[PDB]
Amino acid sequence: STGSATTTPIDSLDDAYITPVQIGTPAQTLNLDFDTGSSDLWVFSSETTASEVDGQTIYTPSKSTTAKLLSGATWSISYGDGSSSSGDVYTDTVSVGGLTVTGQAVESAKKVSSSFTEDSTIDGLLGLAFSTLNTVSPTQQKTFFDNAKASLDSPVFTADLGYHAPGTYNFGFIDTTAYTGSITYTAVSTKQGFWEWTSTGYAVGSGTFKSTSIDGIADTGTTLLYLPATVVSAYWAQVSGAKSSSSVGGYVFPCSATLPSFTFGVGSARIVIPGDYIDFGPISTGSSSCFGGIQSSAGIGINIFGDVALKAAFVVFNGATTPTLGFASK
């Protein structure tokens, strides 16, 4: 079996992408953020504190004939940005673009941090990292992808994110019309529970490619590209007037400047991120200072290949026994 769903940017900056997901019987449609950097499927619900809900669509398990409380199970998650959520667990039927899983753990939020409350367009997250990161206690739960794996024609999912445009998430098949050339596959390490891989180097604009190993994770739930301070200083040194601002919390550049491209290595192949994808607009409305898409990973502890990098390629997440990541130009 296969699944295919459209993913849409939440705003004009591609801050996040939402995909419609059907939960329960009769179906309740929620717009979820597909996250390859986490492993929990959690939603805003009829149990969430009324003051912490601001325009989101909520899941109501009492209105679903297939919903069952997972007695005693609780979950608690904290993200890299400082945001958090916790609550109880239900099992229910979940479908993504025609692909149905029965008995999926659906984590019902009782408490959510202000970061989630502010985003009225996001009804929850659908975790696609390895099930070892799931926060359900005492019984750890499987992700939607892990539960669907047996039914799928191939144990894969693909991410095809658009630049200021909708894209696609496919499950169980590789669309050979969505990319040009061939797909380069690279080894994944599952030791930390992420889609962790090693990039073979980088280039700034039309400069020479520097061969160097950059270990990082493929994360659809992170907006920006976070790389080591050395690489990031070499990129921003090419932008006139660019500087790191402590007040802003990262590199900023004059909105009048043209940004060079950034190339990252995948084995012997090159993926080129156009300069426009690195522009995240004014820091405040009317400002002449613009926020950059390539930032330092020094304060994080891990290099992250987020949406800025992923939307420049057709990306294959191969969940076979020996997992691999595939990259192709598009």
mmCIF file of N, CA and C in Angstrom, residues 91-220:
data_model
loop_
_atom_site.group_PDB
_atom_site.id
_atom_site.type_symbol
_atom_site.label_atom_id
_atom_site.label_comp_id
_atom_site.label_asym_id
_atom_site.label_seq_id
_atom_site.Cartn_x
_atom_site.Cartn_y
_atom_site.Cartn_z
ATOM 1 N N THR A 91 -5.301 5.414 21.708
ATOM 2 C CA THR A 91 -5.021 4.688 20.475
ATOM 3 C C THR A 91 -6.204 5.016 19.561
ATOM 4 N N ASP A 92 -5.935 5.114 18.260
ATOM 5 C CA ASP A 92 -6.973 5.437 17.298
ATOM 6 C C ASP A 92 -6.516 5.170 15.866
ATOM 7 N N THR A 93 -7.448 5.260 14.921
ATOM 8 C CA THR A 93 -7.137 5.064 13.520
ATOM 9 C C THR A 93 -6.618 6.395 12.988
ATOM 10 N N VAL A 94 -5.499 6.353 12.246
ATOM 11 C CA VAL A 94 -4.877 7.546 11.684
ATOM 12 C C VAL A 94 -4.590 7.296 10.206
ATOM 13 N N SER A 95 -4.990 8.233 9.303
ATOM 14 C CA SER A 95 -4.688 8.064 7.887
ATOM 15 C C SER A 95 -3.987 9.284 7.341
ATOM 16 N N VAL A 96 -2.983 9.067 6.474
ATOM 17 C CA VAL A 96 -2.255 10.144 5.807
ATOM 18 C C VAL A 96 -2.319 9.881 4.306
ATOM 19 N N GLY A 97 -3.043 10.727 3.580
ATOM 20 C CA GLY A 97 -3.198 10.636 2.133
ATOM 21 C C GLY A 97 -3.577 9.273 1.586
ATOM 22 N N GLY A 98 -4.546 8.616 2.240
ATOM 23 C CA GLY A 98 -5.027 7.291 1.861
ATOM 24 C C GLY A 98 -4.374 6.113 2.580
ATOM 25 N N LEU A 99 -3.302 6.361 3.349
ATOM 26 C CA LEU A 99 -2.569 5.290 4.056
ATOM 27 C C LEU A 99 -3.046 5.221 5.492
ATOM 28 N N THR A 100 -3.698 4.118 5.858
ATOM 29 C CA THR A 100 -4.322 3.993 7.173
ATOM 30 C C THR A 100 -3.596 3.071 8.153
ATOM 31 N N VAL A 101 -3.468 3.514 9.408
ATOM 32 C CA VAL A 101 -2.867 2.731 10.477
ATOM 33 C C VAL A 101 -3.907 2.641 11.589
ATOM 34 N N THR A 102 -4.220 1.428 12.023
ATOM 35 C CA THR A 102 -5.144 1.236 13.139
ATOM 36 C C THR A 102 -4.285 1.057 14.417
ATOM 37 N N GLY A 103 -4.787 1.518 15.559
ATOM 38 C CA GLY A 103 -4.061 1.385 16.820
ATOM 39 C C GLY A 103 -2.802 2.231 16.939
ATOM 40 N N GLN A 104 -2.808 3.427 16.333
ATOM 41 C CA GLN A 104 -1.681 4.356 16.445
ATOM 42 C C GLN A 104 -1.828 5.092 17.771
ATOM 43 N N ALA A 105 -0.733 5.291 18.506
ATOM 44 C CA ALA A 105 -0.773 6.080 19.730
ATOM 45 C C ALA A 105 -0.916 7.570 19.344
ATOM 46 N N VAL A 106 -1.945 8.229 19.880
ATOM 47 C CA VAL A 106 -2.205 9.642 19.644
ATOM 48 C C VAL A 106 -2.065 10.321 21.003
ATOM 49 N N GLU A 107 -1.029 11.130 21.163
ATOM 50 C CA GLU A 107 -0.774 11.796 22.434
ATOM 51 C C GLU A 107 -1.609 13.063 22.545
ATOM 52 N N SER A 108 -2.551 13.046 23.470
ATOM 53 C CA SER A 108 -3.459 14.160 23.685
ATOM 54 C C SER A 108 -2.816 15.183 24.624
ATOM 55 N N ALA A 109 -2.616 16.416 24.147
ATOM 56 C CA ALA A 109 -2.005 17.450 24.977
ATOM 57 C C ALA A 109 -2.940 17.976 26.049
ATOM 58 N N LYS A 110 -2.470 17.990 27.281
ATOM 59 C CA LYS A 110 -3.193 18.579 28.396
ATOM 60 C C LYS A 110 -2.602 19.982 28.629
ATOM 61 N N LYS A 111 -1.255 20.116 28.537
ATOM 62 C CA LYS A 111 -0.541 21.381 28.672
ATOM 63 C C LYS A 111 0.365 21.611 27.455
ATOM 64 N N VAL A 112 0.396 22.855 26.936
ATOM 65 C CA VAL A 112 1.282 23.244 25.830
ATOM 66 C C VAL A 112 1.974 24.577 26.176
ATOM 67 N N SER A 113 3.238 24.739 25.765
ATOM 68 C CA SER A 113 3.951 25.991 26.016
ATOM 69 C C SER A 113 3.431 27.107 25.066
ATOM 70 N N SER A 114 3.713 28.377 25.400
ATOM 71 C CA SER A 114 3.257 29.538 24.637
ATOM 72 C C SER A 114 3.637 29.513 23.146
ATOM 73 N N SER A 115 4.800 28.942 22.795
ATOM 74 C CA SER A 115 5.247 28.850 21.403
ATOM 75 C C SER A 115 4.202 28.140 20.509
ATOM 76 N N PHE A 116 3.605 27.046 21.018
ATOM 77 C CA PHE A 116 2.593 26.295 20.282
ATOM 78 C C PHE A 116 1.254 27.047 20.240
ATOM 79 N N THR A 117 0.826 27.618 21.380
ATOM 80 C CA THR A 117 -0.415 28.399 21.489
ATOM 81 C C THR A 117 -0.485 29.546 20.453
ATOM 82 N N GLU A 118 0.649 30.244 20.230
ATOM 83 C CA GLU A 118 0.758 31.357 19.284
ATOM 84 C C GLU A 118 0.535 30.938 17.820
ATOM 85 N N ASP A 119 0.956 29.723 17.440
ATOM 86 C CA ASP A 119 0.794 29.245 16.065
ATOM 87 C C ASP A 119 -0.569 28.575 15.870
ATOM 88 N N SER A 120 -1.587 29.361 15.490
ATOM 89 C CA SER A 120 -2.947 28.862 15.269
ATOM 90 C C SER A 120 -3.074 27.913 14.072
ATOM 91 N N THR A 121 -2.102 27.930 13.152
ATOM 92 C CA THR A 121 -2.113 27.082 11.963
ATOM 93 C C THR A 121 -1.646 25.635 12.222
ATOM 94 N N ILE A 122 -0.958 25.385 13.346
ATOM 95 C CA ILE A 122 -0.433 24.051 13.637
ATOM 96 C C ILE A 122 -1.249 23.361 14.731
ATOM 97 N N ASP A 123 -1.906 22.250 14.386
ATOM 98 C CA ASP A 123 -2.744 21.490 15.323
ATOM 99 C C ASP A 123 -1.960 20.398 16.098
ATOM 100 N N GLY A 124 -0.712 20.174 15.721
ATOM 101 C CA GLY A 124 0.122 19.172 16.355
ATOM 102 C C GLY A 124 1.271 18.737 15.475
ATOM 103 N N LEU A 125 2.021 17.734 15.960
ATOM 104 C CA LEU A 125 3.211 17.236 15.284
ATOM 105 C C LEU A 125 3.076 15.755 14.973
ATOM 106 N N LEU A 126 3.680 15.325 13.879
ATOM 107 C CA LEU A 126 3.724 13.921 13.531
ATOM 108 C C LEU A 126 5.203 13.557 13.398
ATOM 109 N N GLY A 127 5.716 12.893 14.440
ATOM 110 C CA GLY A 127 7.110 12.499 14.538
ATOM 111 C C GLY A 127 7.492 11.384 13.592
ATOM 112 N N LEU A 128 8.591 11.573 12.853
ATOM 113 C CA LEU A 128 9.104 10.621 11.876
ATOM 114 C C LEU A 128 10.582 10.195 12.127
ATOM 115 N N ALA A 129 11.150 10.517 13.310
ATOM 116 C CA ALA A 129 12.480 10.017 13.687
ATOM 117 C C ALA A 129 12.300 8.502 14.175
ATOM 118 N N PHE A 130 13.355 7.824 14.664
ATOM 119 C CA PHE A 130 13.245 6.435 15.084
ATOM 120 C C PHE A 130 12.441 6.302 16.408
ATOM 121 N N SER A 131 11.688 5.214 16.571
ATOM 122 C CA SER A 131 10.812 5.020 17.737
ATOM 123 C C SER A 131 11.516 5.029 19.104
ATOM 124 N N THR A 132 12.851 4.919 19.124
ATOM 125 C CA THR A 132 13.654 4.995 20.352
ATOM 126 C C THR A 132 13.564 6.372 21.042
ATOM 127 N N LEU A 133 13.172 7.432 20.288
ATOM 128 C CA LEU A 133 12.996 8.752 20.887
ATOM 129 C C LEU A 133 11.591 9.002 21.416
ATOM 130 N N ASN A 134 10.630 8.070 21.221
ATOM 131 C CA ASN A 134 9.252 8.297 21.681
ATOM 132 C C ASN A 134 9.218 8.499 23.203
ATOM 133 N N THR A 135 8.443 9.462 23.696
ATOM 134 C CA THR A 135 8.432 9.784 25.124
ATOM 135 C C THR A 135 7.326 9.119 25.934
ATOM 136 N N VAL A 136 6.574 8.166 25.346
ATOM 137 C CA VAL A 136 5.492 7.534 26.094
ATOM 138 C C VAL A 136 6.072 6.611 27.166
ATOM 139 N N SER A 137 5.571 6.759 28.388
ATOM 140 C CA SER A 137 5.997 5.997 29.547
ATOM 141 C C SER A 137 4.751 5.413 30.263
ATOM 142 N N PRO A 138 4.815 4.182 30.827
ATOM 143 C CA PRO A 138 5.962 3.256 30.872
ATOM 144 C C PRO A 138 6.219 2.442 29.604
ATOM 145 N N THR A 139 5.254 2.415 28.694
ATOM 146 C CA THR A 139 5.382 1.623 27.476
ATOM 147 C C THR A 139 5.670 2.535 26.304
ATOM 148 N N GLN A 140 6.896 2.499 25.782
ATOM 149 C CA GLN A 140 7.265 3.331 24.635
ATOM 150 C C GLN A 140 6.408 2.948 23.413
ATOM 151 N N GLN A 141 5.968 3.944 22.625
ATOM 152 C CA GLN A 141 5.122 3.701 21.458
ATOM 153 C C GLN A 141 5.861 3.828 20.144
ATOM 154 N N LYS A 142 5.311 3.242 19.068
ATOM 155 C CA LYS A 142 5.922 3.337 17.746
ATOM 156 C C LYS A 142 5.438 4.567 16.963
ATOM 157 N N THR A 143 6.271 5.069 16.026
ATOM 158 C CA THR A 143 5.843 6.172 15.157
ATOM 159 C C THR A 143 4.846 5.649 14.101
ATOM 160 N N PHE A 144 4.141 6.582 13.411
ATOM 161 C CA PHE A 144 3.241 6.282 12.315
ATOM 162 C C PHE A 144 3.991 5.506 11.220
ATOM 163 N N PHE A 145 5.228 5.924 10.906
ATOM 164 C CA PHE A 145 6.003 5.261 9.862
ATOM 165 C C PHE A 145 6.362 3.816 10.224
ATOM 166 N N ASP A 146 6.762 3.591 11.480
ATOM 167 C CA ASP A 146 7.102 2.258 11.964
ATOM 168 C C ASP A 146 5.882 1.316 11.930
ATOM 169 N N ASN A 147 4.711 1.831 12.310
ATOM 170 C CA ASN A 147 3.464 1.079 12.310
ATOM 171 C C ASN A 147 3.006 0.770 10.867
ATOM 172 N N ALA A 148 3.252 1.689 9.922
ATOM 173 C CA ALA A 148 2.818 1.488 8.540
ATOM 174 C C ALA A 148 3.746 0.603 7.717
ATOM 175 N N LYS A 149 5.027 0.472 8.144
ATOM 176 C CA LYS A 149 6.118 -0.223 7.444
ATOM 177 C C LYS A 149 5.752 -1.569 6.788
ATOM 178 N N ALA A 150 5.029 -2.433 7.516
ATOM 179 C CA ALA A 150 4.650 -3.750 7.005
ATOM 180 C C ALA A 150 3.703 -3.662 5.805
ATOM 181 N N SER A 151 2.711 -2.753 5.860
ATOM 182 C CA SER A 151 1.753 -2.561 4.773
ATOM 183 C C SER A 151 2.352 -1.898 3.538
ATOM 184 N N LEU A 152 3.386 -1.067 3.697
ATOM 185 C CA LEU A 152 3.980 -0.325 2.583
ATOM 186 C C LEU A 152 4.628 -1.185 1.500
ATOM 187 N N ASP A 153 4.511 -0.780 0.217
ATOM 188 C CA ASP A 153 5.146 -1.493 -0.901
ATOM 189 C C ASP A 153 6.679 -1.513 -0.698
ATOM 190 N N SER A 154 7.246 -0.383 -0.227
ATOM 191 C CA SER A 154 8.662 -0.198 0.099
ATOM 192 C C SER A 154 8.753 0.511 1.457
ATOM 193 N N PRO A 155 9.709 0.145 2.335
ATOM 194 C CA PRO A 155 9.780 0.810 3.657
ATOM 195 C C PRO A 155 10.460 2.193 3.592
ATOM 196 N N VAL A 156 9.858 3.141 2.836
ATOM 197 C CA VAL A 156 10.408 4.474 2.607
ATOM 198 C C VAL A 156 9.330 5.560 2.696
ATOM 199 N N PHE A 157 9.772 6.782 2.916
ATOM 200 C CA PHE A 157 8.973 7.976 2.791
ATOM 201 C C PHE A 157 9.854 9.041 2.145
ATOM 202 N N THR A 158 9.257 9.912 1.343
ATOM 203 C CA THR A 158 9.984 10.973 0.674
ATOM 204 C C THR A 158 9.438 12.342 1.057
ATOM 205 N N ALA A 159 10.349 13.316 1.099
ATOM 206 C CA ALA A 159 10.031 14.694 1.421
ATOM 207 C C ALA A 159 10.412 15.527 0.210
ATOM 208 N N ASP A 160 9.431 16.261 -0.317
ATOM 209 C CA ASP A 160 9.620 17.136 -1.462
ATOM 210 C C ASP A 160 9.029 18.495 -1.083
ATOM 211 N N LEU A 161 9.787 19.299 -0.336
ATOM 212 C CA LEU A 161 9.293 20.580 0.152
ATOM 213 C C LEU A 161 9.448 21.687 -0.889
ATOM 214 N N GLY A 162 8.442 22.553 -0.963
ATOM 215 C CA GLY A 162 8.439 23.646 -1.915
ATOM 216 C C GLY A 162 9.009 24.943 -1.379
ATOM 217 N N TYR A 163 9.535 25.749 -2.273
ATOM 218 C CA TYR A 163 10.049 27.062 -1.937
ATOM 219 C C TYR A 163 8.892 28.031 -2.173
ATOM 220 N N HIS A 164 8.327 28.585 -1.089
ATOM 221 C CA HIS A 164 7.160 29.478 -1.126
ATOM 222 C C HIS A 164 6.001 28.849 -1.907
ATOM 223 N N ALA A 165 5.872 27.516 -1.805
ATOM 224 C CA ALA A 165 4.924 26.751 -2.571
ATOM 225 C C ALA A 165 4.648 25.416 -1.869
ATOM 226 N N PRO A 166 3.480 24.804 -2.145
ATOM 227 C CA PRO A 166 3.209 23.485 -1.554
ATOM 228 C C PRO A 166 4.126 22.400 -2.127
ATOM 229 N N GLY A 167 4.245 21.330 -1.369
ATOM 230 C CA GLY A 167 5.054 20.188 -1.735
ATOM 231 C C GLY A 167 4.348 18.885 -1.413
ATOM 232 N N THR A 168 5.113 17.787 -1.360
ATOM 233 C CA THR A 168 4.516 16.472 -1.159
ATOM 234 C C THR A 168 5.299 15.587 -0.190
ATOM 235 N N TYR A 169 4.564 14.785 0.596
ATOM 236 C CA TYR A 169 5.120 13.737 1.441
ATOM 237 C C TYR A 169 4.563 12.431 0.891
ATOM 238 N N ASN A 170 5.428 11.530 0.351
ATOM 239 C CA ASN A 170 4.941 10.238 -0.153
ATOM 240 C C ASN A 170 5.391 9.103 0.771
ATOM 241 N N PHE A 171 4.567 8.065 0.941
ATOM 242 C CA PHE A 171 4.876 6.900 1.745
ATOM 243 C C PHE A 171 4.758 5.631 0.893
ATOM 244 N N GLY A 172 5.808 4.811 0.916
ATOM 245 C CA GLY A 172 5.812 3.506 0.263
ATOM 246 C C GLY A 172 6.255 3.444 -1.176
ATOM 247 N N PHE A 173 6.624 4.580 -1.769
ATOM 248 C CA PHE A 173 7.074 4.594 -3.163
ATOM 249 C C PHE A 173 7.950 5.813 -3.474
ATOM 250 N N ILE A 174 8.792 5.685 -4.494
ATOM 251 C CA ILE A 174 9.649 6.765 -4.956
ATOM 252 C C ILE A 174 9.152 7.271 -6.317
ATOM 253 N N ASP A 175 8.696 8.521 -6.376
ATOM 254 C CA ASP A 175 8.194 9.119 -7.605
ATOM 255 C C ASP A 175 9.370 9.540 -8.497
ATOM 256 N N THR A 176 9.638 8.755 -9.553
ATOM 257 C CA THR A 176 10.748 9.035 -10.466
ATOM 258 C C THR A 176 10.549 10.268 -11.340
ATOM 259 N N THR A 177 9.374 10.919 -11.294
ATOM 260 C CA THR A 177 9.155 12.151 -12.069
ATOM 261 C C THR A 177 9.389 13.430 -11.233
ATOM 262 N N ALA A 178 9.593 13.295 -9.910
ATOM 263 C CA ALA A 178 9.778 14.437 -9.020
ATOM 264 C C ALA A 178 11.234 14.928 -8.892
ATOM 265 N N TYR A 179 12.183 14.300 -9.593
ATOM 266 C CA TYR A 179 13.586 14.714 -9.512
ATOM 267 C C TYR A 179 14.321 14.548 -10.852
ATOM 268 N N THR A 180 15.474 15.201 -10.978
ATOM 269 C CA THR A 180 16.348 15.106 -12.149
ATOM 270 C C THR A 180 17.637 14.332 -11.751
ATOM 271 N N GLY A 181 18.283 13.706 -12.727
ATOM 272 C CA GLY A 181 19.500 12.940 -12.511
ATOM 273 C C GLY A 181 19.262 11.671 -11.713
ATOM 274 N N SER A 182 20.230 11.306 -10.872
ATOM 275 C CA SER A 182 20.082 10.122 -10.036
ATOM 276 C C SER A 182 20.110 10.471 -8.539
ATOM 277 N N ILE A 183 19.638 9.556 -7.709
ATOM 278 C CA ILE A 183 19.624 9.753 -6.264
ATOM 279 C C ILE A 183 20.914 9.222 -5.651
ATOM 280 N N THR A 184 21.607 10.039 -4.845
ATOM 281 C CA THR A 184 22.798 9.570 -4.159
ATOM 282 C C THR A 184 22.383 9.150 -2.773
ATOM 283 N N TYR A 185 22.648 7.888 -2.403
ATOM 284 C CA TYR A 185 22.347 7.401 -1.062
ATOM 285 C C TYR A 185 23.574 7.487 -0.142
ATOM 286 N N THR A 186 23.342 7.732 1.148
ATOM 287 C CA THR A 186 24.391 7.900 2.145
ATOM 288 C C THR A 186 23.989 7.187 3.437
ATOM 289 N N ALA A 187 24.988 6.722 4.213
ATOM 290 C CA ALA A 187 24.739 5.968 5.435
ATOM 291 C C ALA A 187 24.136 6.771 6.574
ATOM 292 N N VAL A 188 23.212 6.145 7.280
ATOM 293 C CA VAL A 188 22.557 6.743 8.424
ATOM 294 C C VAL A 188 23.040 6.045 9.704
ATOM 295 N N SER A 189 23.265 6.820 10.762
ATOM 296 C CA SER A 189 23.570 6.280 12.065
ATOM 297 C C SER A 189 22.297 6.483 12.887
ATOM 298 N N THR A 190 21.818 5.421 13.528
ATOM 299 C CA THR A 190 20.619 5.507 14.363
ATOM 300 C C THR A 190 20.936 5.569 15.868
ATOM 301 N N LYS A 191 22.224 5.694 16.250
ATOM 302 C CA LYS A 191 22.672 5.704 17.644
ATOM 303 C C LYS A 191 21.967 6.738 18.548
ATOM 304 N N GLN A 192 21.656 7.943 18.046
ATOM 305 C CA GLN A 192 20.930 8.933 18.866
ATOM 306 C C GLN A 192 19.402 8.979 18.576
ATOM 307 N N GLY A 193 18.911 8.116 17.691
ATOM 308 C CA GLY A 193 17.506 8.064 17.321
ATOM 309 C C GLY A 193 17.088 9.025 16.217
ATOM 310 N N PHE A 194 18.050 9.711 15.581
ATOM 311 C CA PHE A 194 17.767 10.666 14.502
ATOM 312 C C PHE A 194 18.208 10.113 13.146
ATOM 313 N N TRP A 195 17.805 10.794 12.053
ATOM 314 C CA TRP A 195 18.275 10.467 10.711
ATOM 315 C C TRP A 195 19.645 11.222 10.603
ATOM 316 N N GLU A 196 20.686 10.653 11.235
ATOM 317 C CA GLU A 196 22.009 11.270 11.324
ATOM 318 C C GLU A 196 22.909 10.784 10.211
ATOM 319 N N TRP A 197 23.550 11.699 9.502
ATOM 320 C CA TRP A 197 24.379 11.347 8.344
ATOM 321 C C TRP A 197 25.625 12.239 8.263
ATOM 322 N N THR A 198 26.547 11.952 7.321
ATOM 323 C CA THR A 198 27.754 12.755 7.194
ATOM 324 C C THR A 198 27.897 13.405 5.834
ATOM 325 N N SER A 199 27.851 14.737 5.811
ATOM 326 C CA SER A 199 28.025 15.532 4.604
ATOM 327 C C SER A 199 29.534 15.608 4.287
ATOM 328 N N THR A 200 29.883 15.511 3.006
ATOM 329 C CA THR A 200 31.279 15.465 2.585
ATOM 330 C C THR A 200 31.955 16.822 2.347
ATOM 331 N N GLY A 201 31.257 17.921 2.612
ATOM 332 C CA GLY A 201 31.856 19.236 2.412
ATOM 333 C C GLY A 201 30.916 20.348 2.008
ATOM 334 N N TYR A 202 31.492 21.488 1.632
ATOM 335 C CA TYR A 202 30.698 22.647 1.289
ATOM 336 C C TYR A 202 31.398 23.614 0.346
ATOM 337 N N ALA A 203 30.634 24.539 -0.263
ATOM 338 C CA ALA A 203 31.178 25.623 -1.083
ATOM 339 C C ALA A 203 30.304 26.890 -0.902
ATOM 340 N N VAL A 204 30.932 28.062 -0.919
ATOM 341 C CA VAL A 204 30.197 29.324 -0.813
ATOM 342 C C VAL A 204 30.164 29.963 -2.194
ATOM 343 N N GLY A 205 28.960 30.186 -2.728
ATOM 344 C CA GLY A 205 28.751 30.746 -4.060
ATOM 345 C C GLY A 205 29.507 29.999 -5.147
ATOM 346 N N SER A 206 30.294 30.722 -5.949
ATOM 347 C CA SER A 206 31.094 30.093 -7.003
ATOM 348 C C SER A 206 32.526 29.697 -6.546
ATOM 349 N N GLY A 207 32.771 29.674 -5.234
ATOM 350 C CA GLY A 207 34.057 29.293 -4.670
ATOM 351 C C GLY A 207 34.383 27.810 -4.764
ATOM 352 N N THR A 208 35.621 27.454 -4.438
ATOM 353 C CA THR A 208 36.091 26.067 -4.464
ATOM 354 C C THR A 208 35.462 25.235 -3.349
ATOM 355 N N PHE A 209 35.163 23.986 -3.657
ATOM 356 C CA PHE A 209 34.568 23.072 -2.703
ATOM 357 C C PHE A 209 35.608 22.605 -1.689
ATOM 358 N N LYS A 210 35.286 22.735 -0.400
ATOM 359 C CA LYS A 210 36.154 22.261 0.650
ATOM 360 C C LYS A 210 35.674 20.906 1.163
ATOM 361 N N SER A 211 36.505 19.869 1.008
ATOM 362 C CA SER A 211 36.204 18.529 1.499
ATOM 363 C C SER A 211 36.443 18.491 3.000
ATOM 364 N N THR A 212 35.383 18.265 3.775
ATOM 365 C CA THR A 212 35.412 18.177 5.231
ATOM 366 C C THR A 212 34.131 17.479 5.705
ATOM 367 N N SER A 213 34.243 16.654 6.741
ATOM 368 C CA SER A 213 33.126 15.907 7.282
ATOM 369 C C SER A 213 32.273 16.723 8.235
ATOM 370 N N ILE A 214 30.990 16.881 7.899
ATOM 371 C CA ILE A 214 30.037 17.574 8.748
ATOM 372 C C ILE A 214 28.953 16.570 9.112
ATOM 373 N N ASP A 215 28.918 16.151 10.359
ATOM 374 C CA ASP A 215 27.897 15.234 10.839
ATOM 375 C C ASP A 215 26.670 16.066 11.250
ATOM 376 N N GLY A 216 25.489 15.621 10.851
ATOM 377 C CA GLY A 216 24.257 16.322 11.181
ATOM 378 C C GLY A 216 23.010 15.494 10.941
ATOM 379 N N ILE A 217 21.845 16.033 11.325
ATOM 380 C CA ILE A 217 20.575 15.336 11.164
ATOM 381 C C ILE A 217 19.666 15.973 10.090
ATOM 382 N N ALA A 218 18.907 15.145 9.374
ATOM 383 C CA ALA A 218 17.955 15.630 8.373
ATOM 384 C C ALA A 218 16.686 15.902 9.176
ATOM 385 N N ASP A 219 16.350 17.180 9.391
ATOM 386 C CA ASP A 219 15.208 17.529 10.235
ATOM 387 C C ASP A 219 14.177 18.462 9.569
ATOM 388 N N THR A 220 13.050 17.872 9.117
ATOM 389 C CA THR A 220 11.952 18.608 8.483
ATOM 390 C C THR A 220 11.232 19.570 9.451
#
